Write a structure and sequence with these properties.
This is part of a larger assembly, with 13 protein chains of ten kinds.
Chain A: H1 2-13, H2 17-30, H3 64-83, H4 128-131
Helix pairs in contact in A: 1-2
Chain F: E1 19-24, E2 35-41, E3 54-59, E4 84-86, H1 88-97, E5 101-102, H2 104-111, H3 134-143, H4 148-160, H5 167-173
Parallel strand pairs in F: 1-5
Antiparallel strand pairs in F: 1-2, 2-3, 3-4
Chain H: H1 40-44, H2 70-85, H3 91-97, E1 106-109, E2 119-128, E3 135-143, E4 146-147, E5 152-153, E6 162-164, H4 209-219
Antiparallel strand pairs in H: 1-2, 1-6, 2-3, 3-4, 3-5
Chain F binds one RNA strand through strand 1.
GO biological process, one term (chain C): mitochondrial RNA processing
GO cellular component, one term (chain C): mitochondrial mRNA editing complex
PDB class: ribosome
RNA sequence: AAAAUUUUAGGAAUAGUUAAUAAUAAUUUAUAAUUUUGAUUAGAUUGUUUUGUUAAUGCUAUUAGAUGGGUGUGGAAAAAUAAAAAAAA
């Protein structure tokens, strides 16, 4: 499930709905515990990978001399929209904003074979006044630290 | 004639209106992100500009301009040289102004 | 604009009926004119053959005062009021007249009343609008107290040194702590005034 | 109250969108994947695509492309009026357009009637030309409309139009046309080039002598 | 707050407010009668506002004059004493 | 201007807004409740160490018997007393020069002191509100209108100045023969 | 109101500031322009008393 | 601000009105500027009980299997026209009827002419959208004789409730330019018989007897029942 | 280590595709150095680092840029005769060679200058490179090609950059233009060529 | 607000003081009398520094010509007809305030101007935006209505019922 | 009675007559057993009538009930919609956009067939 | 409706006539003598009016 | 111009500045001429839009009837000339000294 | 903006680092900066002459607050809860 999460996020970051949706369906069919309601329809059925334009079935290709002008306009518009920088970011995709990862041990835990890439647990798990009374050590140095 | 006139006018602009909005500069083909943001926004009312307090501030290579010690000193000689050697450098009203600008700012 | 004003006034006095036309053509839309122009043009208007022409000219002049931002002066308004019987041109606002009614009746009643003519110290004046008292109430006490350890007191405290003993002090600080600072618990003399008015209160 | 502080500022004065709450969360990875799959579902693109971050409705270029890439419901016109109706929707319904129809175009639409289905198409065009495009018809508009009705043989339609002419926009209905439709004067015009009181069945009835 | 009488223009909309906020011309007229009765109260309020402004602004002048006189005497005496002490030192 | 508004204490024109005279209470049972006339912001500041702008006075809403009855008894001096302390100089400062706002409860309390007229909401249930007619009002104004100079001089005395010296005082202040 | 110029001149004194000749000139000029010649002479007397 | 309601008067926080000034109260909210508005909820909402009983057709329903009888489409046209006119007429709906798109004639809203209020716009230009019911209209506003100097865009030109009274004299060809109507007194002299001014900057209408009776009955001065 | 390092594996360099791969990787490496984000970078002589490199925790702020510059210089020593081969059909275009030369020149211009005592290298390694031979090679390959400087707007920038390289690296600017322009003339300075062909 | 002075200096030092002479410059203007176009004379007051050149004086005159009718075509300065050398100092011509000097307007057009130098330019480099009047004409001491007087609404230490000490500081 | 939480209309039987309603003070109003809000509403309406303002105000119950069906946290007059987990067709299982049957939809209607037969 | 006056240009025509002269300090001695005669005449005028 | 002689409003054929100083010195300049003749090296666009011609209605009626309005765009597309042709005499009284009284086309 | 006042039985190293700068947005220059006069990290940890006690400048106690990724809106984020500070008749 960790692998599926990371790879799905990477594909979405890299603009790959086909691979992300195929991965979701594959995970749902293989029954990985986190992904058993994430099965979704395949909207690319009967489509090639490498050599065009996708049409709904109630659409017809424009005359080719005009379809060329339309595709020329569309690539230019897509790149123009992509170029503009989004403020109050750092060139960081939403999948990687607020994305700190440190291993499992960093928050009061130890090795386990099944946790291959285990982000340290949320700091909300433990409270100081829940672990020890006031003005007394809680015996968990380093916790609560990013 | 046109080039010399515009050069002297630019010298006077930077001398008499230092750091002024009319003395600002910008990178050629400068990237003004506010215009680009407005072009790609669902603007229902085309008067509420999005990302205003930042877009209005930011523009590529935008600076306030003014004359420093070296610039003023070199521009004095170049302005005096643009004139003919027979002219009186005392009565130029721009070399004198540049010299007084240097003296005032150094003081 | 004053030059055109004298021109218009001369026309009105000379009795020609073209002062209004000159005002419209030369100073209405092209100048920032006060209502003295209209104070003259109203006399010009008052000599019109038709009473309705007089009234309509007055109303149009008022509309000009509104459209071009030139308020109607009190003298102009009173001039137009003095002819309310012949031309019924209202000149006072429906709020202004109401406040006038109530305030004037109240004031005449108050003046004719005798008891309320008596002075009222609470409403008549302000006493001592200054930031500080005009006399010494004794405070502050620039000395601590036996139960007090915070000797200098810090930001808001007037106390400047510990109550009874302190570390050695030098120069003006020693002089002040020993003699000159305010000691408000003294039973023989109160804190001491500046030089010219300590002598006359010595006894 | 106002949604100025409940939704981003680029959605001010926004109305009628699918669900303006979607575009506040499209930034999540799952909703971004949904957005790209939805663009593929809509079609008209050769590469994965996401709507611009500060836009809720589709970009104007994308909507224009998808409107151009829309197959017309007819898909094969049998008659010139069907072809002309396809042309009419191509020209006066293209996308966010500006050019209004004109009475001469309406006349051309009406004079190509060969089937009563064609007349139905032409009357739909007339309704669009009177309601959507508030354009004044011409003086001969009712003439051409009556001729279109008669060449296909629907007198009740022309009679209903005469009954409701002002709402229909027929500001000028010639007296002879009105008289024919309302009973007597079984002819409605005199052919100048042929000297015959149309309809021809009525001319053969009254005028037995043809003249140039 | 703004009163919405039952008899102003109602908005026959089921996607918002059921009553508009316009008003019959009678409601326009009577509102003035209430406005005017309120304005006569505002006349005296503002009048006293400005009168108290003036009273405070004048009592300051009188008090500051006496303070200035006494404080200038204080200043002269203190400066003379300071000069004497400096001479002794 | 909050995404979710403070539903129970809404205000006008944002924070901290204009100063206002309010009659602040205490978190106590009514049996001991007393108020204090304070000047504060429209949006009560509970963040800074400075909660209020000025402390005008205190009011005790519980009547007290006249302990001073024997002293020169005057008409009805035995009626119960409602005690109040008020800072009149500071009130005049904040009311006049600062143009602060005034709540109705403090306005009614101050009208008892001769400092302000009876409030707008201190309405007698008996007399109905007036009905105004422009014609009658105009007739009254014309019947007894003041003259320009007297009106202007009353206005000047009320608002602009009140220490205008007489010719006698000007002559007294005028310097004398030696001119040194 | 014109009295406010004199009030602000007096606040300088009450705050232990030394008003300058420019302050005195400005106060006299403003009061004379407002027509308060007695207040202008009061400003002069304040200067002298200072 | 420029236009306080009662000078500086803060007695009750309602003394300033429901809008402190005509200018917008922020540079970033220009739409908040004070103006005259109209009730779009009632005006824009046409009555649908007229479209009841007729099957309209989608503009995209260009297919042949879904098209109606000629008489049915004519009834749909009539019903749609009555539906559009149900609430009132747009300035554009009147201009399309007008000879030169109305240029030269004077349009007005119903309440622009009611007691003490006299105002209308002499049309100068119309730009119809593809939907001829919408667009942009320009004109010269005339208020009690005083008129603007330049043509300005007419607000709420779309909202129904507009009126026009045609006269052949005012119509101007598209060749010509509408001349701005004169300002009474400035451009043309004042004549009481031609135009008599209803109101002016210090005039208040007399109290209607029915209104005073109603308000006294409400207040309780008069014995209602 | 750089991707150019993994390309120069002692293999048969005489492959056209390998040549473009090497050229693009070197150009990318130079661009990476030149547009490097130097916000937290600090080069202050620190005594503690005498017998060692900058601390492990201070590799990025203190060692990264210096290592990158040394790597660029060393890989240049290996790649220059491949990208800009000496003058005797050619694998690379004059435009590609000029772009690589320009980015290398920018890196040389913004080389690292401060020599710490901890460094075991030679002081001369912290000075700008000289690209006279490469500029001459590009000049041969540019004169052999016509319409190199066209009226296109970007060609103005190309002309300016080419003149800059020629002025800086002591190579006559005339070489960038056909020899017929130089025939019959004893000597034409870079400035004269600029004012003639600008 | 960086006006370049950060302390109160009540004096005027030498560098801002300038030595200048009040010259009068005559102009040939035509007035319309009942007959038509009677010739008349117009003057402009100029405060030229003693050491200025005639070209500088001409350029100054260009700047006080608020009149849209007076200095519109290229002109030259002359004394009793004898044209003046534009690079000659005033002292070398001996011109004083009692010197009749005329401005002959050659009938050219498009007089090249440079308003780049503010009318009020001293060594202190102040730039007041309004250039509607010269510094020598501005009174410079008048009530400023574009502002609001502000009272002290922040009590320092004393807030209320009893002024014990005033919590000074 | 205008407010949903001030059901003044539920206590018509709590007063005997017009004068009994108008003379009862807050204490007797509470004693008769009326909630705090209904009590205050009755008292304020009576006092407004006394001052000359009859109870003439718009019943807001239907407006507030319309606005209560949305999730405005502060019970303001906005409209905050709900975003379900699945809000797109492909996400709801619909493989691809529906295709219209052009041959079926391009057939001559029955009125057209009948009239064409008639000609 | 009306023609306004922006902060850039005096676009309504002056409402009062003003004299085009330097300040009293920039006058010559004889120029200030002319000014002195003018000012004593002004004082004669104001005293006559008083 | 109808009531005062303004200096440089009535002129000869056309201000002939050099082709290099044209866009620097010319923009912002205005002048009137007798008869309708257009400048050199310009592309003419006669405005026919009623929404644009409505704005000369008060000029067309109360000052002078306007024949035509045209926009002349430089061949380089960097400078623009709004040129308006009026017909007939002025609807305003023209003073004998007014610079517009020196125009044959007027009066 | 600044000055100034903290704790730990087993007491040592700290760093997106100091200053200069024609450098908004630092490719630069320097023998830089913090720390045994106790730093950094870790532990404890809102401050807090208001509490309590005493012959006591001792001991002792405490709840005013504040809050770099949730909308870039707004004058200002303090914005998901609101004993109510009455909020434009």
């Amino acid at each position: 499930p960790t692998m599926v999460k990371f790879y799905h996020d990477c594909l979405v970051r890299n603009n790959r709905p086909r691979e992300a949706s195929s991965l979701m369906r594959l995970a749902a069919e293989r029954g990985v515990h986190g992904y058993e309601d994430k099965w979704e329809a395949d909207v690319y059925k009967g489509r090639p990978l490498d050599s065009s334009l996708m049409l709904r079935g109630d659409q017809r290709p424009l005359p080719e001399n005009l379809q060329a002008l339309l595709e020329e306009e569309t690539t230019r518009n897509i790149e123009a929209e992509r170029s503009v920088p989004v403020p109050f970011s750092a060139g960081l995709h939403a999948t990687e904003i607020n994305s700190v990862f440190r291993p499992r041990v960093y928050r009061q835990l130890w090795y386990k074979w099944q946790h291959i890439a285990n982000r340290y647990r949320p700091t909300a798990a433990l409270k100081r006044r829940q672990l020890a009374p006031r003005d007394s050590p809680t015996g968990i140095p380093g916790f609560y630290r990013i | 004639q046109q080039l010399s006139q515009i050069a002297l006018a630019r010298c006077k602009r930077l001398l008499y209106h230092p750091d002024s909005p009319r003395a600002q500069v910008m990178s050629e083909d400068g990237y003004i992100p506010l215009v680009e943001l407005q072009r790609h926004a669902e603007g229902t009312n085309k008067a509420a500009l999005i990302h205003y307090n930042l877009g209005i501030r930011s523009a590529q290579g935008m600076r306030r301009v003014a004359l420093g010690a070296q610039s003023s000193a070199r521009l004095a000689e170049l302005v005096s040289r643009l004139e003919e050697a027979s002219a009186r450098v005392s009565g130029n009203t721009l070399v004198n102004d540049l010299v007084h600008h240097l003296s005032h700012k150094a003081a | 604009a004053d030059m055109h004003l004298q021109v218009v006034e001369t026309m009105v006095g000379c009795g020609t009926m073209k002062a209004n036309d000159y005002f419209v053509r030369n100073v209405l839309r092209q100048f920032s004119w006060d209502s003295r122009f209209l104070e003259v043009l109203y006399v010009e208007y008052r000599r019109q053959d038709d009473v309705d022409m007089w009234a309509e000219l007055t109303k149009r002049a008022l509309v000009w005062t509104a459209r071009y931002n030139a308020p109607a002066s009190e003298r102009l308004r009173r001039l137009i009021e003095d002819d309310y019987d012949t031309i019924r041109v209202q000149t006072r606002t429906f709020r202004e007249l109401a406040v006038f009614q109530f305030r004037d009746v109240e004031e005449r009643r108050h003046s004719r009343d005798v008891v309320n003519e008596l002075p009222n110290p609470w409403y008549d004046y302000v006493a001592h609008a200054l930031p500080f008292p005009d006399r010494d109430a004794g405070y502050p006490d620039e000395y601590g107290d036996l139960g007090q350890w915070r000797a200098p007191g810090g930001p808001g405290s007037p106390v400047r040194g510990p109550g009874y003993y302190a570390p050695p002090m030098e120069g003006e600080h020693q002089r002040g702590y020993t003699a000159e600072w305010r000691d408000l618990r003294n039973p023989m003399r109160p804190p001491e005034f500046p030089t010219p008015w300590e002598r006359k209160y010595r006894q | 109250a106002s949604l100025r502080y409940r939704r981003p500022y680029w959605m001010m004065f926004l109305k009628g969108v699918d669900n303006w709450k979607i575009y506040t969360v499209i930034q999540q990875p799952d909703h971004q994947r949904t957005e790209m799959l939805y663009q593929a579902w809509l079609g008209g693109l050769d590469r994965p695509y996401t709507r611009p971050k500060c836009m809720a409705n589709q970009p104007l270029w994308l909507s224009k492309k998808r409107h151009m890439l829309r197959k017309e419901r007819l898909d094969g016109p049998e008659t010139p009026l069907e072809k002309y109706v396809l042309e009419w929707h191509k020209k006066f319904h293209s996308f966010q357009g500006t050019e209004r129809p004109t009475p001469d175009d309406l006349h051309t639409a009406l004079d190509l009637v060969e089937r009563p289905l064609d007349l139905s198409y032409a009357l739909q065009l007339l309704g669009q030309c009177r309601n959507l495009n508030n354009i004044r018809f011409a003086k001969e508009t009712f003439l051409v409309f009556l001729e279109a009705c008669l060449r296909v043989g629907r007198r009740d339609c022309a009679e209903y139009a005469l009954e409701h002419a002002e709402p229909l926009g027929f500001w000028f209905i010639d007296e002879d046309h009105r008289r024919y439709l309302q009973g007597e004067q079984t002819w409605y015009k005199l052919s100048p080039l042929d000297n015959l009181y149309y309809p021809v069945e009525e001319n053969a009835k009254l005028n037995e002598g043809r003249k140039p | 707050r703004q009163i919405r009488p039952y008899y102003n223009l109602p908005s026959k909309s089921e996607h918002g407010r059921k009553m508009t906020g316009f008003l019959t011309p009678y409601r326009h007229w009577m509102w003035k009668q209430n406005e005017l009765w309120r304005n006569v109260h505002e006349a005296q309020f503002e009048h006293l506002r400005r009168v108290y402004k003036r009273q405070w602004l004048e009592s300051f002048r009188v008090n500051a004059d006496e303070y200035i006189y006494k404080y200038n005497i204080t200043k002269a005496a203190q400066l003379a004493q300071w000069e004497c002490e400096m001479k002794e030192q | 201007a909050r995404a979710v508004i403070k539903r129970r204490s809404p205000q006008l024109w944002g924070a901290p807004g204009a100063p206002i005279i309010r009659m602040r209470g205490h978190h106590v049972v009514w049996k001991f409740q007393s108020y204090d006339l304070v000047v504060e912001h429209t949006h009560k500041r509970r963040n800074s160490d400075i909660r209020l702008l000025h402390y005008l006075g205190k009011h005790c809403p519980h009547p007290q018997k006249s302990l001073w009855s024997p002293d020169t008894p005057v008409a009805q001096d035995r009626h119960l007393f409602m005690l109040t302390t008020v800072d009149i100089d500071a009130f005049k400062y904040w009311f006049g020069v600062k143009r602060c706002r005034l709540s109705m409860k403090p306005w009614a309390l101050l009208a008892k002191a001769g400092l302000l007229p009876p409030s707008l909401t201190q309405n007698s249930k008996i007399m109905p509100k007036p009905l105004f007619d422009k014609e009658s009002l105009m007739r009254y104004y014309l019947a007894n209108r003041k003259d320009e100079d007297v009106m202007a001089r009353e206005k000047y005395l009320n608002y602009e100045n009140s220490m205008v010296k007489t010719e006698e005082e000007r002559a007294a202040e005028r310097p004398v023969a030696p001119y040194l | 109101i014109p009295q406010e110029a004199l009030h602000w001149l007096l606040r300088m004194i009450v705050d232990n500031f030394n008003p300058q000749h420019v302050h005195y000139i400005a106060a006299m000029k403003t009061l004379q322009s407002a027509g308060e010649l007695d207040m202008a002479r009061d400003v002069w007397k304040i200067m002298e008393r200072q | 601000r420029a236009d306080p309601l009662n000078g500086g008067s803060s007695m009750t926080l309602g003394s300033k009105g429901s809008k402190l000034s005509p200018e917008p109260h922020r540079r970033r909210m220009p739409w908040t500027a004070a103006k005259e508005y109209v009730p779009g909820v009632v005006l824009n909402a046409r009555d649908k009980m007229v479209l009841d009983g007729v099957q309209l057709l989608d503009i995209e329903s260009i297919d042949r299997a879904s098209q109606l009888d000629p008489l049915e489409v004519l009834r749909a046209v009539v019903a749609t026209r009555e539906y559009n006119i149900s609430t009132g007429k747009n300035i554009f709906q009147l201009a399309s009827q007008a000879t030169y798109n109305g240029r030269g004639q004077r349009f007005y809203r119903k309440e622009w002419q009611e007691g003490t209020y006299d105002k209308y716009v002499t049309l100068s230009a119309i730009d119809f959208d593809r939907d001829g019911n919408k667009g942009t209209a320009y004109g010269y506003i005339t208020f009690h004789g005083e008129t603007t100097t330049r043509p300005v865009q007419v607000d709420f030109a779309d909202v129904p409730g507009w009126y026009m009274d045609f006269v052949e004299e005012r119509a101007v060809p598209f060749t010509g330019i509408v001349p701005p109507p004169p300002s009474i007194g400035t451009d043309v002299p004042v004549d009481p018989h031609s135009y008599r001014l209803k109101a002016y900057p210090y005039y208040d209408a007399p109290n209607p007897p029915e209104f005073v009776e109603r308000l006294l009955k409400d207040r309780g001065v008069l014995p209602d029942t | 280590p750089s991707p150019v390092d993994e390309c120069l594996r002692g293999g048969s360099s005489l492959d056209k595709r390998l040549i473009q791969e090497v050229r693009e990787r070197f150009v990318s490496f130079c661009r990476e150095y030149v547009l490097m984000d130097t916000s937290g970078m600090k080069s202050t002589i620190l005594s503690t680092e005498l017998n060692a490199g900058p601390d492990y925790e201070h590799y990025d702020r203190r060692l990264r840029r210096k290592r990158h510059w040394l790597a660029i210089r060393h890989r240049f020593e290996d790649v220059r005769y491949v990208i800009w081969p000496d003058v005797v059909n050619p694998s690379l275009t004059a435009g590609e060679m000029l772009e690589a030369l320009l980015w290398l020149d920018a890196a040389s211009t913004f080389c690292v200058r401060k020599v710490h005592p901890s460094d075991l290298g030679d002081k001369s390694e912290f000075l700008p490179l000289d690209l006279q031979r490469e500029v001459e090679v590009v000049a041969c390959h540019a004169r052999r090609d016509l319409d190199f400087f066209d009226p296109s707007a970007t060609s103005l920038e190309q002309f300016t950059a080419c003149a800059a390289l020629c002025v800086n690296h002591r190579v006559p600017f005339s070489l960038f233009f056909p020899a017929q322009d130089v025939c019959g003339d004893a000597s034409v300075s870079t400035g004269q060529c600029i004012v003639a062909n600008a | 607000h960086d006006t370049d002075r950060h302390y109160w200096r009540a004096v005027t030092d030498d560098p801002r003081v300038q030595h200048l002479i009040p010259l009068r410059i005559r102009f040939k203007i035509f007035t319309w009398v009942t007959s038509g176009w009677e010739q008349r004379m117009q003057v402009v007051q100029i405060m030229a520094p003693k050491d200025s050149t005639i070209a500088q004086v001409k350029d100054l005159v260009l700047v006080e010509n608020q009149s849209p009718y007076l200095c519109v075509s290229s002109f030259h300065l002359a004394i009793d007809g004898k044209e003046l050398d534009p690079q000659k100092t005033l002292g070398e011509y001996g011109v004083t305030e009692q010197s009749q000097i005329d401005a002959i307007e050659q009938n050219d057009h498009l007089l090249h101007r440079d308003d780049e130098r503010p009318r009020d330019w001293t060594v202190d480099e102040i730039t007041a935006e309004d250039v509607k009047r010269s510094p020598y004409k501005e009174m410079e001491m008048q009530p400023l209505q574009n502002l609001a007087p502000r009272y002290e609404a922040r009590p320092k230490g004393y807030f209320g019922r009893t002024y014990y000490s005033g919590m000074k500081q | 009675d205008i407010h949903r939480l001030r059901p003044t209309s539920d206590f018509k039987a709590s007063f005997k007559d017009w004068n009994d309603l108008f003379t009862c003070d807050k204490r007797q109003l509470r004693v008769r057993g009326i909630p705090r809000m209904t009590r205050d509403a009755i008292r304020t309406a009576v006092q407004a009538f006394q001052n000359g303002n009859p109870p003439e105000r718009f019943d807001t119950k239907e407006e507030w009930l319309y606005y209560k069906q949305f999730k405005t946290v502060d019970y303001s007059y906005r409209v905050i919609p709900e975003l379900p987990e699945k809000y797109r067709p492909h996400q709801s299982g619909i493989d691809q956009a529906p295709l219209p049957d052009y041959r079926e939809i391009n057939k001559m209607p029955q009125w057209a067939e009948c009239e064409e037969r008639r000609q | 409706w009306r023609l306004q006056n922006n902060g850039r240009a005096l676009a309504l025509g002056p409402s009062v006539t003003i004299e085009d002269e330097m300040q009293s300090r920039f006058f010559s001695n004889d120029q200030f003598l002319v000014h002195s005669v003018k000012e004593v005449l002004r004082i004669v005028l104001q005293e006559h009016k008083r | 111009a109808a009531s005062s002689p303004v200096p440089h409003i009535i002129s000869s054929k056309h201000i002939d500045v050099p082709r290099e100083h044209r866009l620097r010195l010319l923009p912002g300049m205005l002048y009137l001429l007798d008869g309708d003749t257009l400048p050199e090296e310009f592309t003419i666009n006669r405005v026919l839009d009623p929404t644009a011609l409505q704005y000369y209605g008060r000029l067309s009626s109360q000052i002078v009837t306007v024949e035509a309005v045209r926009m002349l765009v430089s061949d380089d597309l960097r400078l623009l000339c709004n040129c308006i042709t009026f017909k007939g005499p002025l609807h305003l009284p023209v003073a004998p000294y007014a610079s517009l009284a020196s125009l044959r086309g007027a009066s």
